[PDB]
Design a protein around this ligand. Structure first.
Ligand SMILES: CCOP(=O)(O)OC[C@H]1O[C@@H](n2cnc3c(N)ncnc32)[C@H](O)[C@@H]1O
Length: 664
């Protein structure tokens, strides 16, 4: 087809897979027809095992059919390993002077080249602080509320070393969102930093943590706090007895505790991390990832989707508060001994050339970013890109949202000067790593398509009418019909909800996305089919936004829908009703918007607020009829469907008239 972009010749010669699509298809076919042998070989080849699984022909067991019993998957049962050991110790001392992170702060005067040897020292130091000053034991939960600095990777790996369970809270979340996650995870310890900065704006991490910790204590929790010195100590307060500066904890270490810390050898299905993730229903829930399968899957996808070789220099722009930073900043890259760029700042400070200054300075060859960022760079204009030397780039990656042809072409042919392959990687928190993706050198690309499934992955298109598999070119519900090593194993404390959310169609993992498969077998992701939003690349649920809106004292109820937004991809549209007698003013609407930002964070800011004067559209039971609100927010006033269940049909006329006025 004419929209196909061939892989570059040079990448084809370098590829771990081969120079032609036939090479990929040969491996893919093997990974399905001989699935256990495939993963056994990869696992043995590329990872360290203290103990291996007993049988190469049965490295997985599973059930995807609720009628046969509980849903479950297990990978490498019987094997024993450690993620920190694979990320760090095993590379030493051979690679002690190899750079692990080229770190730069938000402030371009702040830089450090952190070697693998230095990471080892930093990690054994912190692990010993955790074990012997905080008494952190295997299985204990530790919360992280950190900026993108070396200490963030150190903290993740130190917890893995001792078998603690991390839960990472994105630094953009508010105190209330942080507290909620610490409460649900029952963290014994919060690791944070004094402060960071986003361009010109200070980010007062410990000050926010103080409010979250006060809220947790008022509910009876006792959470200690360890604070890294990222700035000058003078942005935050410290509570005697609860809060410790990391430098003070370091000083208490014995000399030996700077050189060695025992490794906790983990069983395959021991929990590695909990990641709170927005869903179609209810508040964010903790997705559970275990040890052996996730380790293998995050690392193997990193290697093949980006074709990482030891002479490559890798830069992913994601934060550790989201799954992309787990799999594709810290765990996967370090397990394959990558040299990476670690960047605390933002793409527009000091100006929109910053990421390209990083690419040139560190000779980056693989850049993994997101369409929201790409759209913002495009809007800033090509001259911010072209002042940078991009000759070293050979692979560009995109994650988290659909990317249109114009942005894809701009990424490759302006950003990458037309000498790069592009890996548009589709996957989710629940899948651990990439699921549908190009591979450099061997995969013809279609701009806008994720292309072909990763090795071992069997996607299907389910018919939205009767929910069976569709053959041939087809559009419908995206599902996965067989297990893969990186699959999340449960929702923390609520396996019933896990089965209900993802396994409602027996035999399939239901993604929540829709997709079209074309006549070449390439997949085109068309977005969520449930109520989940994708706002500036952040996955957010309508329920926490509505719950946040409803905490404003004047608000009776609300309903949130998404709408197309040029920069954010999807914006947040709020319909809401106020108590009888409320004076509706611009200041009131501003206070409701600020309430959402207080309860959740800036990432959930409403873009439009429409006052439903008579009420939200609702059935006799009280159920808000959301399709009505969806159609209105788009201007489509004739395609609403049926309203006969509306206890208050008077509401409709008001909703269309108001929208025409606001003109979103
Ligand atoms: C890794 C982030 O994982 P999550 O934060 O859990 O968001 C997962 C959700 O992002 C969306 N998505 C992710 N990658 C793509 C892509 N390449 N093209 C289109 N849409 C994408 C999709 O809707 C999915 O279900």
């Amino acid at each position: 087809d004419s929209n196909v972009v061939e892989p570059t010749e040079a990448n084809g010669k370098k590829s771990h897979v081969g120079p032609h699509l036939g090479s990929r298809m040969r491996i893919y076919e093997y990974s399905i027809e001989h699935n256990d042998a495939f993963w056994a070989e990869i696992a043995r080849r590329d990872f360290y095992w203290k103990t291996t699984w007993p049988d190469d022909q049965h490295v997985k067991s599973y059930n995807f059919d609720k009628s046969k019993g509980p849903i479950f998957v297990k990978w490498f049962e019987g094997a024993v390993t450690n993620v920190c050991y694979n990320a760090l110790d095993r590379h030493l001392p051979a690679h002690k002077d190899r750079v692990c992170f080229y770190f730069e702060g938000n402030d371009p005067s702040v830089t450090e080249a952190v070697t693998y040897g230095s990471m080892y020292t930093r990690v054994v130091e912190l692990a010993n602080v955790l074990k012997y000053q905080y008494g952190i034991a295997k299985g204990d939960r530790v919360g992280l509320y950190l900026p993108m600095i070396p200490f963030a990777a150190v903290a993740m790996l130190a917890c893995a070393r001792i078998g603690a369970v991390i839960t990472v809270i994105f630094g953009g979340f508010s105190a209330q969102a942080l507290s909620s996650r610490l409460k649900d995870a029952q963290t014994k310890l919060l690791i944070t930093a004094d402060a960071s900065a986003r361009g010109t704006k200070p980010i007062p991490l410990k000050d926010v943590a103080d409010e979250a910790l006060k809220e947790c204590e008022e509910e009876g929790m006792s959470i200690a706090c360890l604070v890294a010195e990222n700035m000058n100590r003078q942005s935050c307060k410290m509570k005697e007895g609860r809060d410790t500066w990391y430098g003070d904890a370091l000083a208490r270490l014995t000399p030996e505790q700077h050189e060695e810390c025992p490794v906790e050898w983990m069983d395959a299905e021991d929990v590695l991390f909990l990641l709170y993730t927005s869903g179609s229903t209810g508040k964010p829930k903790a997705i559970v990832h275990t040890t052996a399968g996730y380790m293998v899957y995050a690392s193997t996808t990193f290697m093949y989707s980006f074709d990482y070789h030891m002479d490559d220099v890798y830069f992913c722009t994601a934060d550790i508060g989201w799954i992309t930073g787990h799999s594709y900043v810290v765990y996967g890259p370090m397990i394959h001994c990558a040299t990476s760029v670690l960047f605390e700042g933002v793409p527009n400070y000091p100006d929109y050339s910053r990421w390209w200054q990083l690419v040139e300075k560190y000779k980056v060859s693989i850049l993994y970013t997101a369409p929201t960022a790409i759209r913002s760079l495009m809007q800033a204009g090509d001259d911010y890109v072209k002042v940078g030397n991009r000759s070293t780039l050979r692979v560009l990656g995109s994650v988290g949202e659909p990317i249109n042809v114009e942005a894809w072409k701009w990424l490759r042919d302006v950003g990458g000067e037309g000498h790069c392959d592009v890996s548009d990687t589709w996957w989710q928190t629940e899948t651990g790593g990439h699921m549908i993706t190009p591979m450099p050198g061997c995969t013809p690309m279609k701009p806008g398509s994720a292309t072909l499934p990763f090795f071992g992955v069997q996607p299907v298109i389910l018919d939205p009418m009767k929910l069976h598999e569709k053959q041939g070119p087809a559009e419908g519900l995206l599902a996965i019909r067989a297990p893969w090593p990186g699959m999340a194993r449960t929702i923390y404390g609520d396996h019933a909800r896990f089965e209900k959310t993802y396994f409602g169609v027996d035999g399939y993992y239901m993604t929540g996305d829709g997709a079209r498969r074309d006549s070449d077998g390439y997949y085109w992701i068309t977005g969520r089919v449930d109520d989940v939003l994708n706002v500036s690349g952040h996955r957010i649920g309508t329920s926490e936004i509505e719950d946040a809106v409803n905490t404003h004292p004047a608000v009776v109820e609300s309903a949130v829908v998404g709408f197309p937004h040029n920069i954010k991809g999807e914006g947040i549209y709020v319909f809401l009703t106020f108590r009888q007698g409320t004076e509706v003013t611009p200041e009131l609407l501003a206070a409701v918007k600020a309430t959402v930002r207080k309860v959740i964070g800036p990432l959930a800011t409403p873009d439009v607020m429409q006052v439903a004067r008579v009420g939200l559209p609702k059935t006799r039971s009280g159920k808000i009829v959301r399709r009505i609100l969806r159609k209105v927010s788009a201007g489509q006033y004739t395609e609403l469907g049926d309203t006969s269940t509306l206890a208050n049909p008077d509401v409709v006329e008001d909703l269309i008239a108001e929208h025409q006025r606001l003109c979103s």
